[PDB]
Write a protein that binds this DNA or RNA. Sequence first.
RNA 1: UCGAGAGGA
DNA 2: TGTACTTATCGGTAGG
DNA 3: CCTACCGATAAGTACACGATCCTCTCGAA
Lengths: 112, 269, 168, 96, 170, 559, 87
Amino acid sequence: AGRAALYKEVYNVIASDGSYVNYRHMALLVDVMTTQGGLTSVTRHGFNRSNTGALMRCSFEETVEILFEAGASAELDDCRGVSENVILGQMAPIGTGAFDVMIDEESLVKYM
Amino acid sequence: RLVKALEDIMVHYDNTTRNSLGNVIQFIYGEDGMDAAHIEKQSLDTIGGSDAAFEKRYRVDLLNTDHTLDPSLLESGSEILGDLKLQVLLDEEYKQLVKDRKFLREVFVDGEANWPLPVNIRRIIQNAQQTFHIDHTKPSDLTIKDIVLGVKDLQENLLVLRGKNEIIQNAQRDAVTLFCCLLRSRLATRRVLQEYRLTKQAFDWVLSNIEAQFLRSVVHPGEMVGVLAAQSIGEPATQMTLKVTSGVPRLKEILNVAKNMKTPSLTVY
Amino acid sequence: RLKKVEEEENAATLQLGQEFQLKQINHQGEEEELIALNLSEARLVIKEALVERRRAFKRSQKKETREKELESIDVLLEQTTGGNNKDLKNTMQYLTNFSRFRDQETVGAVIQLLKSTGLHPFEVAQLGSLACDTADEAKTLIPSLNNKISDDELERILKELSNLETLY
Amino acid sequence: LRFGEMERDCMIAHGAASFLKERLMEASDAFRVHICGICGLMTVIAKLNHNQFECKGCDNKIDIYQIHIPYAAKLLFQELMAMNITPRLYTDRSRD
Amino acid sequence: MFFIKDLSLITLHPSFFGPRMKQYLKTKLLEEVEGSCTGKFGYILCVLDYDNIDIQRGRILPTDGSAEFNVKYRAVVFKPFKGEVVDGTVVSCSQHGFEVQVGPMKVFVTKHLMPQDLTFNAGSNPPSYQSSEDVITIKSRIRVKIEGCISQVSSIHAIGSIKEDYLGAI
Amino acid sequence: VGQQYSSAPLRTVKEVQFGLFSPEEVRAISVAKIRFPETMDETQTRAKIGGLNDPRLGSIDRNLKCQTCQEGMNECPGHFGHIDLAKPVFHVGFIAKIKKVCECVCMHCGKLLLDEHNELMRQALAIKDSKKRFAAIWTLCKTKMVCETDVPSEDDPTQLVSRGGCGNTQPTIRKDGLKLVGSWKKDRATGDADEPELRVLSTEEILNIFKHISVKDFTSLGFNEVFSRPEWMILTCLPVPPPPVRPSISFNESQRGEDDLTFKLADILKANISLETLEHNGAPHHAIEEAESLLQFHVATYMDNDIAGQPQALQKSGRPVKSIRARLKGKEGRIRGNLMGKRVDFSARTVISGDPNLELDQVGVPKSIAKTLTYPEVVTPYNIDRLTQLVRNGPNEHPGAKYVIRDSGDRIDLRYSKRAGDIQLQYGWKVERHIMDNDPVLFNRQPSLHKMSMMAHRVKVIPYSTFRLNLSVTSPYNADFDGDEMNLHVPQSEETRAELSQLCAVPLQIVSPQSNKPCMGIVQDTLCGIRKLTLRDTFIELDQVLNMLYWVPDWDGVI
Amino acid sequence: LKEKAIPKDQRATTPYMTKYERARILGTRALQISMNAPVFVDLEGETDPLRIAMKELAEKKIPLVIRRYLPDGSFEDWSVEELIVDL
RNA sequence: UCGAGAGGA
DNA sequence: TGTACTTATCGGTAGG
DNA sequence: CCTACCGATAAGTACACGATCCTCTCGAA
Ligand SMILES: [Mg+2]
Ligand SMILES: [Mg+2]
Ligand SMILES: [Zn+2]
Ligand SMILES: [Zn+2]
Ligand SMILES: [Zn+2]
């Protein structure tokens, strides 16, 4: 019920001036803040303090603070995120990079 | 903050809105699973209007002299009269149409009919009447079994989630609901002949063009969605030039959460 | 990972490398036993692989006796592989001069005789490669035996190896 | 010209994963570094003429992998080593 | 002694993406593998069975057009051990000792690792090692026990001894 | 690429594990000793002493050297060294973590304060987290200030059983800068009457307690068995970053101009050399601790110089030293400034202009900009005649080339080169050619707020130096032409340019997914004139009616 | 842990080619053509390698196979021929 | 080049 | 300007 | 009817954050 009220409040500010933004965008942000258990702040201590790969988190304010926690607690960055593949300098698993492409020898002969 | 909070979020290949770690935020993107660009503000005619006009515009009664279809609309309009087997499905059609009005009034309690939904049926029928040059003088080539069955057979083809088990099949039915409610509203057995005058050749084309435009309107796996949403909410906030708190100072409270006054005026009824 | 202990020293107490296990894996997936070869076994395997190589190299082109084995192997090494391979010529030179059995028929019985007794494929690769006369000679040069095989039962095999022994 | 966070953000939104990566590497930093596959650090002493690739600390001339990563990342992991932090770069998967 | 092992290895340029690819890749495999000498596997001598080679699929790399193919193959290996008794042929004969060409690897035996009752003969060419009626010259097949192994470059070397029962000249 | 071929496998970084440097591994990892705190000259003649800078690591001035591996500045990755600290010291980052681990595990034995038998202890250890589990473990062992020997009385009938070693009283610990102090109570009608006893807790005491901590006490407090052992939170052996991390810069030729860290690294060696000689020579008891606090402070401000509101440390002149934390801190500092966002090549920027005769997807690039930016085209049988004709035109005639890359990595600068006029051009070679018409290129206007503002644009090479663009595309970018500038990015690969034309095209981005409606509209004169024209009042005579029709590029030819 | 790939039967993925796949398959085929790779379709005097890759898809003569990964690691290998180009 | 200062939609 | 972390005094609960 | 302990709500102190890009010039100990 809390998230349903949260959407009403977010949508009411977008409606106040500048109608409109599609339900999909605000309901995603709202579902992000509530698919946690309670309410999640969109700040350095709210969302940024989560079970996320250390490199993704250090790129938002608490940089060396989080990187010290990463080493002291022996955290492992999964390399599955957007941010950690940008730092590594690899084709990130986003749209074009979310699938791999192989060549088929069965098809190579078929077409000559 | 918004853009950094929703970087990881992306529509996966199994129509589910997950992230980097793999936690689920939404099971179907924005509840319907459509690429936001292929949507138009469409009107649901089953929710709006009086019960007298709704019963007049949609109720089909072959077992009556004044509530039947005139043979100038149907090719077989006189041999379809007094048919009990054909009225069984025309009762089944109107019993689903009266269910739609009661369910829609539960969803949109405010009474508004114009809502954004995929596939512009409004124009798909407007172009069919021009593409085939259909005249209002001569009767159609289709019958009642062709309309009421063809409309229901199309509803199966409109796939969002690729099913096999009880969960995915029920999630598929839940995903369409509001769209097929509009489809039942627009392709009613009476409406197809009374207002549109669709020939069997042009009707089969309209059903396929609806299926084709719907499968085009489905979200593309790889769409960054969260990144898209983060910018789609943050951009209008930049142009907030226009005694309760509103605009950007109120927008900080809704992000911060944030147990301070400003204007906590609760509403009692 | 993180240096590791290293394992153990490579010895003649069947303490083979951390890679060469008594029971290892296959490309297909099965748990196949270790494939160790002696000087007769390894000579007939490279000759077989290079005889079948020229057959495949010339398919695409479309659209016995001691000293006679030395010259025929030397020609085969030049056609199938280029001059760049120095190691293979020295090995094939050494394998044909020190092979115990020349005929593929005799080798089959040698492997059936040895790979059956209950000995590691490396001990078999060492028995079939080195010529031994006394039971004690084999027990000293291949120290992995001792308890693994009986002194008189090992002599029974050693006698049969002199009968299986080929003429040069 | 600068291709910062705001410029990277839109290229993710579009879905062009390789154009963003090319802008980030081929048109900017891009550096090939040898890493020890056993520990995951840049401990490798790569001689590209005598071929003595040896990693002092793991006695290995076999488990060594070269990688194209940005020169600033190489530099960042070296700064983290200077602060007693170990960003062990592993090319092998172990968590599904 | 010599083993047959199941082991694997390749990035292929897009200009070679034609029907004559499977055979061209098989050549790229033997071009590097055939002749190589790894520290863990030993000398890679001959890639067995040129036919039936498993190649699977080549994932075309991110920004370049090259295909990364995994080539599963079978090849003969020459891997020695510290204790492995080997009978090669004497190739180098000198005052210090002798070098034994056991297949593709050279093994060195010092004057101290061999018996004290033998000694080198300088007044005989090719250089020789006498005792009674046993002489070690330019050829002379010898039985050596590998006491130690040297990994060095892509060419394994050893340090064997011939001072024991049943050892020496053969 | 980092130049030159390598005979090693190339494989993507699939995961990155974090941990701490073991002072035992830092000794094996190290190639340097770092005894001398001086940097430039031999002793002291010319080119770096074998103490700090190139003892057996990174090269310096155009010399390949690099501990015999050579390779040169552009290839040499820099090698790590080690510096032995006379007395162990805390790590600035793990100050509260060391203090909170001491507040949980009791001292004198190195064993947990509460272990298994307590019901709340089982309720806190129930979570298999890392920090959330340790968060409860801190609040539980924070109190119950004495270690225990015998404790269960209401689980076994009455008698109590022993699970611990020594029952010594754990003290209350607080922070007074770089050091920690514990308050032992006692005072039960015995020593110190009623006031407690306070002790300065040295790193040598804490480290030996952390060494005696059990293998299960690591997992209970959020530590790893091989990556992050609590003993490595205290530094006994410090690693030294090579020259690529702290360069010499080179002031002219015979001058210096070293990096802020090279001076700071020597300052830790200077603070350590005073203790190294004091511990061996005349020891004045409470005068070595006065210097030990300065070595602790030197290693502290090297990593963190923007510490608590007590010390500062500045490298005279008055400007303060930039620490490793301040160097890679957010906003224009390594993570956000050199990794999340970077400066790029094959880019342009100039004042923008509007045009009614440009296509919606077109961009008017000036001749000087297209002649400066290059696209590397590979020599194929489909170009050859075209590619050689551009090489023939050279770097001054508009459709021309600047550099020709041959079979091996050898750039041929056509601006100079004795053979510029000749050039045969073989297949497989790369020819860097001037930008030409209808080339997919990214055109951008900062701030980049939404998915748009960064779109693909068909190129049209035009005179008059200014970025020309269509009028209707003023809305997605938001900018007008009141002295506004715009970026430009030429893609270098055939794949990235196909990822721009088949994804980010200007007309492909006509309908906005934000408001499910279009994000491009007819504006200004085109919107003002369309109302004036579209009304029953106005008609157009035959003469102007045929020019109105010819202006339409897809006109059928039917009046 | 073992494999995770579901066969070319019983697949829960879209039979249509995603806009990102279309741009990638063209991008890589146009790159390979530009790098001298052998062209399978009959050339009609095409000097641009993307114009070639675009026709290559129309005739369905591309020998590429797409590996569509799911969140649990499982993948379904879809050959370019199997996928339908609506978009 | 560091820093400060100034200036631009 | 707001959040989060950390320590000191304080009324009562019921058990021997 | 009193005490060994055990939860209250306090108030104080401490935390490193805040448009995007771009351009020009001055003066070090
Ligand atoms: Mg994680
Ligand atoms: Mg402006
Ligand atoms: Zn290592
Ligand atoms: Zn170097
Ligand atoms: Zn204790």
